[PDB]
Design a protein around this ligand. Structure first.
Ligand SMILES: Nc1nc2c(ncn2[C@@H]2O[C@H](COP(=O)(O)OP(=O)(O)OP(=O)(O)O)[C@@H](O)[C@H]2O)c(=O)[nH]1
Ligand SMILES: [Mg+2]
Ligand SMILES: [Mg+2]
Ligand SMILES: [Mg+2]
Ligand SMILES: [Mg+2]
Ligand SMILES: [Mg+2]
Ligand SMILES: [Mg+2]
Ligand SMILES: [Mg+2]
Ligand SMILES: [Mg+2]
Ligand SMILES: [Mg+2]
Ligand SMILES: [Mg+2]
Ligand SMILES: [Mg+2]
Ligand SMILES: [Mg+2]
Ligand SMILES: [Mg+2]
Ligand SMILES: [Mg+2]
Ligand SMILES: [Mg+2]
Ligand SMILES: [Mg+2]
Ligand SMILES: [Mg+2]
Ligand SMILES: [Mg+2]
Ligand SMILES: [Mg+2]
Ligand SMILES: [Mg+2]
Ligand SMILES: [Mg+2]
Ligand SMILES: [Mg+2]
Ligand SMILES: [Mg+2]
Ligand SMILES: [Mg+2]
Ligand SMILES: [Mg+2]
Ligand SMILES: [Mg+2]
Ligand SMILES: [Mg+2]
Ligand SMILES: [Mg+2]
Ligand SMILES: [Mg+2]
Ligand SMILES: [Mg+2]
Lengths: 68, 511
RNA sequence: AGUAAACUGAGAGUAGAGUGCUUAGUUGAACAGGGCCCUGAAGCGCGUACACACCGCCCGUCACCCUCCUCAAGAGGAGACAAGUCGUAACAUGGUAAGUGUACUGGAAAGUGCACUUGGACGAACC
RNA sequence: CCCCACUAUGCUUAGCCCUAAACCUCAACAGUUAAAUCAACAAAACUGCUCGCCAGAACACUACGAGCCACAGCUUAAAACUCAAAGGACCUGGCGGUGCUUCAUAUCCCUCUAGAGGAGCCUGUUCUGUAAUCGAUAAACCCCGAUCAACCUCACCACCUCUUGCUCAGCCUAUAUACCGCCAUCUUCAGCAAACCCUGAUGAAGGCUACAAAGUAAGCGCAAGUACCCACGUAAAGACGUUAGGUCAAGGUGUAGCCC
RNA sequence: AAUAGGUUUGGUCCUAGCCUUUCUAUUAGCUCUUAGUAAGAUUACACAUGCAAGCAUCCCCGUUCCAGUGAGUUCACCCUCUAAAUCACCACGAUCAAAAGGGACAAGCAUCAAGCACGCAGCAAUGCAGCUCAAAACGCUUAGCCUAGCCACACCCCCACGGGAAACAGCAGUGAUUAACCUUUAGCAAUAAACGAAAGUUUAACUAAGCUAUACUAACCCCAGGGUUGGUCAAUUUCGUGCCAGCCACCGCGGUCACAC
């Protein structure tokens, strides 16, 4: 993230149904997303990540819920 | 979470039990006459009308001799699960042997696993077959075994009547009875997507009577039965136990071999939801482990698969999973599905630079044009081994060329000279060619008492103050290397060689 | 100013231990006049893009990654990321006042010529 | 940047180019000073009418399109990606290789005296070394904690030994960037501030002129008194705060940590 | 945008953007007891199957309607003229309403500024050289609209002789596609339409049902989940974490005492 925040935000590049490649943040602690997996991505920018304006919807398609 | 799962009913009461037809599955090796025997029983010919004369699907047919449900399992090694599914659902197994092979042994093992009676059919007629089967725990009545052996000739239609008589006798001995009333219990034999009838499942009813409008659940899927048809496509108003049926109306496509249970009403969904949740939990546990394992720390062929039926897709995926040449080339399965090649498959292949493989599925002109525009390669096959060969060819294409080194000549150094040319001291090795010849174009390597010192091409080949391209055997030649760091001794050796690129074939074997 | 300098003695602490520290005494000077040029202080102002406050802020060139745009896919541009490197261009009269147009020149901020602006000052009776 | 020489150029004629902080950054015309004058600064506040222009910053006096005698040009002029700001004017403070004036009294300069930096030694520190402490470490550390280490001191290292242990345990273990306690420093200053009151249109803020014009001020500090030989000098004193200044190793103590 | 609120800065004032608070709709996550009513593919992409137009003494009439979709798009409204249709038959007319004529009629772009024959006179021959336009002509892109309903389309070639080719934008349903996903129900009993002189017949119009928390209404002896808790903005105890994991609509939090994970 940009200053003054510091972290390793879990992001993934995905090709959308519109044919456009975009970077989507993966919220929640821990994820098992892999190549060729299908996700549902919604809006809502990640504030500390420049250029990231999408977010993976946890609990839909291959992206499971956050494991307690 | 509360358990809302729909479970199989307890074993039917003896009073409620009613005699039913038998389910007989024909199993055996490739080209052992299973399809021909089934054609003779069915009074119709379909072995001739096939792609390559190979049974690639498990089909159930209600034959009227009495009535029996014959299941034609494929004999190929690819569709092992298919055969297993038949063994799981059958009551009697007709093991067809041409006058014992690997797939026959596998089918025998499946029948033993399922604890089902076996009737041997010696097609193309025998004693040698029974003696061999003695090793595989298939003992004939001539050898004191329960298994009945019938020599038959399917092509000429000989002795088939006695085979049917033995099947009927074994069915009568088994006394197959089931409850023809109450909630329906059955098993999926196949599932596919018809462009007109939606998601369709070929199933076999095990208990209860299925009727239009019955709400069924199978795995993560559920349906409100919309059309029940037979093999000929005609609608049937009821589906008694031990009756094949094509059921339409599935909201999602069930996996082959999944049990089907009838429920009270659609708000079924809950049951499906519960099952989904269970699966998620299982995956979640695995996910948790993997995630924890991470948190404590802190030549790529991509293939799309589109098949006509889920069973064929499963067989192809099992074949793919038997890939063991990941070191030379990595085979990634981007996406597998059921049905004709579609826009999503083309987009996925384009995204990952993959290749679409279509087993018994089509691709319209629009789809083909889109794939050509996007550089996607669609490969449609109708035979499983053809698809396997094509996949092997693609994998070999992905493999890098293999360089073959052929020795051309050999020369031994005699003297070392220092020539002053262009203000530069060039070390020159006086070499005598012992065997073969040395060529300027061909590469060279330096050998020091068996050790390999240098590998490359000469910067200058010169003999008797004249440049000669090829020096014959016994000809002296001064050799100069491009590498100045190389030291030339009195006893060094030089081996010339020609390097030719050769096509490399994949080490993976489908068997 | 009994100050600097030189000489002598005593005490603290130690069983003993300092060329050290504290302290008493003795002999005992020179310059002390000019200056706001240097460095600071005060009074009245002036300027300020700094405010953990000039050890501030800040500009441009020379690598990687990311997004977008214009493109004969090689490339250019913008923004973000923000490093390291070369200078210190701007903010105080920023140490050559700053800037506009334009022309030429330069590793880079930028320099210079010409005209213009105050979004600078000229200390605000005489001296 | 400073000095020297010279060219394009500045001049004339004939065409072009058509840009300026082309700004008096304040449109033309007609009218008012009435009040409800008026964010701030600037060059007071306005009214009627009309035209031109403006609509977050940056991209951007840019790209593309178009027009032009212009061909590295001028005019018109976007969009995408990005940010929660950008901006205008102020208040207070700091700072200025900032102006004027007055000073510095061991003192800023020229000056006066004795030294240090050169030598040997004593002693401290850095660096190297060792199995072998720690802390201070610009002014405001460096014969410093020590008015003091051969054993002890000692908290260091190596080996050996003990486990309710001198203690109703213990720890010189971490944190002085949690502190008390004692201090350095500006200070070789003179200001800090309760409670009120007034000005700023009731903004941050500010509050003095003695022929006085909004300040009054308890209290702390300076000063006065006091110690030594005076009233002089030297001591002592020296506030609020500054440097997250020094000390967890004077002792105590928060938090965290070890308990064969 | 309002009764407004947070947010520029060391601080204040002004301008300004962004966001919050409110009300809907769609989708997604988690969750969900019942009843009534209303509403209900993302797609002018392709469609399996079943039905959706008959009636009637033969001729005729209807199948040009209803039903559907929103691709295209200033054919919708007012006036003049007057076709077809109803009033059995003329109505020497009324109602209704085509074509034709006049007028009015969406949004963005001027970096779309010129269009290039877009006019007039004459009976005609032919003559004049004009006509529209910065008060937006011409052009490009977007869009069903002004909702008792109206306009347009009916697989495409605007049309449909013809060609491409064999058509669900009728109902139920399906494939593909999308974040988007209603039953392959019944009856003509009510109304409407078609036919008949009529008893009547037919109708996937419609009626009565089916599925769905999309909405509203109402209830339940038992049956409640979702989000949030630093400020705006109602509401946190203790542990773990230690600028990491993570959170945030904006300001921002997290570096060993976290009201923000
Ligand atoms: N000589 C002989 N040949 C026979 C007889 N029955 C069948 N065949 C032949 O054997 C072949 C059997 O192969 P298939 O018809 O494909 O039957 P299958 O054993 O199920 O083979 P798969 O479908 O590939 O598993 C047929 O092509 C016949 O021509 C027989 O009774 N005698
Ligand atoms: Mg066969
Ligand atoms: Mg400078
Ligand atoms: Mg300057
Ligand atoms: Mg200049
Ligand atoms: Mg120059
Ligand atoms: Mg000069
Ligand atoms: Mg002159
Ligand atoms: Mg001028
Ligand atoms: Mg310009
Ligand atoms: Mg330009
Ligand atoms: Mg251009
Ligand atoms: Mg010395
Ligand atoms: Mg030391
Ligand atoms: Mg230290
Ligand atoms: Mg010692
Ligand atoms: Mg210790
Ligand atoms: Mg401190
Ligand atoms: Mg003192
Ligand atoms: Mg005093
Ligand atoms: Mg400190
Ligand atoms: Mg320290
Ligand atoms: Mg549409
Ligand atoms: Mg343009
Ligand atoms: Mg449209
Ligand atoms: Mg169609
Ligand atoms: Mg048409
Ligand atoms: Mg339909
Ligand atoms: Mg579908
Ligand atoms: Mg919906
Ligand atoms: Mg009638």
């Amino acid at each position: 993230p940009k200053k003054p925040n510091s972290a390793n935000r879990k992001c993934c590049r995905v090709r959308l149904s519109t044919g456009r490649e975009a970077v989507c943040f993966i919220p929640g602690e821990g994820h098992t997303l892999q190549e060729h997996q299908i996700v549902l991505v919604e809006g809502g920018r990640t504030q500390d990540l420049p250029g990231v304006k999408l977010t993976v919807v946890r609990g839909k398609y291959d992206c499971g819920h956050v494991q307690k | 979470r509360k358990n809302k799962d729909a479970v199989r009913r307890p074993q039917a009461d003896p009073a409620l039990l009613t005699p039913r037809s038998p389910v007989v599955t024909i199993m055996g090796h490739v080209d052992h006459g299973k399809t021909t025997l089934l054609d003779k029983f069915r009074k119709t010919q379909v072995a001739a009308v096939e792609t390559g004369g190979i049974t690639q699907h498990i089909g159930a047919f209600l034959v009227s001799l009495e009535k029996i449900t014959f299941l034609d399992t494929p004999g190929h090694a690819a569709f092992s699960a298919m055969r297993a599914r038949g063994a799981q659902v059958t009551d009697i197994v007709v093991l067809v042997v041409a006058a014992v092979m690997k797939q026959t042994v596998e089918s025998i093992q499946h029948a033993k696993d399922a604890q089902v009676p076996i009737i041997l059919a010696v097609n193309k007629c025998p004693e040698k077959v029974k003696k061999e089967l003695l090793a595989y725990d298939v003992v004939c009545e001539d050898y004191g075994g329960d298994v009945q052996a019938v020599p038959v000739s399917a092509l000429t239609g000989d002795n088939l009547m006695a085979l049917a008589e033995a099947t009927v006798a074994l069915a009568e001995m088994l006394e197959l009875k089931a409850d023809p009333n109450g909630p329906v219990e059955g098993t999926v034999i196949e599932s596919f997507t018809d462009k007109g009838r939606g998601l369709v499942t070929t199933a076999i009813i095990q208990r209860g009577t299925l009727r239009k409008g019955s709400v069924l659940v199978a795995g993560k899927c559920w349906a409100k039965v919309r059309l029940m048809f037979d093999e000929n496509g005609k609608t049937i108003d009821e589906a008694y136990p031990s009756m094949p049926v094509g059921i339409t109306g599935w909201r999602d496509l069930p996996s082959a071999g999944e049990e089907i249970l009838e429920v009270e009403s659609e708000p079924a969904r809950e049951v499906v939801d519960w099952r989904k949740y269970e699966q998620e939990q299982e995956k979640g546990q695995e996910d948790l482990k993997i995630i924890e394992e991470k948190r404590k720390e802190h030549n790529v062929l991509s293939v799309i698969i589109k098949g006509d039926v889920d069973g064929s897709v499963e067989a192809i995926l099992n074949i793919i999973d038997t890939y063991d040449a990941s070191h030379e080339c990595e085979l990634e399965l981007v996406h597998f599905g059921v049905g004709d090649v579609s826009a999503n498959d083309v987009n996925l292949a384009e995204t990952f630079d993959g290749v679409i493989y279509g087993f018994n599925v089509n691709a319209g002109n629009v789809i083909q044009q889109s794939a050509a525009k996007k550089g996607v390669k669609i490969k449609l096959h109708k035979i499983i081994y053809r698809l396997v060969e094509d996949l092997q060819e693609e994998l070999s294409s992905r493999l890098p060329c293999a360089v073959e080194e052929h020795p051309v000549g050999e020369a031994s150094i005699l003297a070392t000279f220092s020539v002053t040319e262009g203000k530069k001291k060039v070390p020159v090795a006086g070499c005598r060619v012992q065997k073969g010849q040395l060529e300027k174009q061909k590469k060279f390597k330096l050998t020091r008492n068996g050790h390999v010192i240098w590998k490359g091409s000469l910067t200058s080949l010169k003999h008797h103050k004249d440049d000669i391209s090829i020096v014959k055997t016994g000809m002296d030649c001064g050799l100069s290397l491009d590498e100045d760091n190389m030291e030339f001794q009195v006893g060094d050796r030089i081996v010339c060689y020609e390097e030719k690129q050769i096509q490399a074939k994949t080490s993976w074997d489908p068997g």
